[PDB]
């Protein structure tokens with residue numbers, strides 16, 4: 001077949017390092033690049049091609065129901081088992097992850113056009129802000 | 134609002150490293166992770182939440198019609214101009230990238246469940262294999 005439409009996930013990657021070295025791509029960009037999965041999305045109408053290649057590091061999925069506490073394995077992250085509960089404090093999605101780490105959790109809330117995410121573990125607070133795409 | 138649906142992209146990320154040390158995430162991983170941008174896909178139904186967070190390095194999009202030559206500026210990659218032509222050699226999509234480097238181009242083709250991709254430059258060949266999703 002000539003029909004390549006799809007979302008394609010890298011299964012294996014050989015001498016990627018050689019190919020970038022030939023492109024004169026720098027060492028810092030290369031040591032990252034070799035630690036990533038590529039995803040190629042191809043949208044194709046006969047001779048018309050649209051191609052997007054993304055390079056991922058890790059994926060953190062969580063499915064939950066507010067108020068229903070759940071067992072979470074943080075594979076991808078620190079690979080620990082916690083005991084998670086998400087509730088509403090007003091506008092704010094609050095999650096408490098019980099386990100070995102003190103003060104471990106997160107807050108997620110909307111203000112205006114933006115999403116706010118506070119990540120907390122111990123006395124470290126990471127704050128992130130997102131725009132809609 | 135409590136409605137958090139959307140596909141969100143990070144515009145800032147404060148103290149991701151402090152948070153990551155706190156979790157006991159390893160050094161090498163922290164150094165990659167800190168150099169990525171994040172996307173949170175949020176699927177929300179009442180109190181049902183499906184959350185997916187990706188970490189993402191560089192992307193590469195390219196649009197073309199087969200048989201029509203175009204100037205491809207590899208913004209992001211090596212930042213060079215090439216005259217790129219994509220043709221069919223049987224079931225194999227073949228791109229030659231006329232520019233500074235010799236033997237610069239690639240080959241896409243499907244064989245069964247898999248997409249096969251060859252990237253070449255100079256005297257280097259990179260093989261990749263992908264999976265339908």
Ligand SMILES: *C/C=C(C)/C=C/C=C(C)/C=C/C1=C(C)CCCC1(C)C
Pocket residue numbers: 057058059060076077106108117119153158166171173184186187188
């Ligand atoms: C509601 C969204 C939440 C709770 C997002 C959590 C995301 C993280 C805790 C970030 C995880 C990552 C690291 C700690 C380093 C590796 C890359 C990430 C982004 C998966």
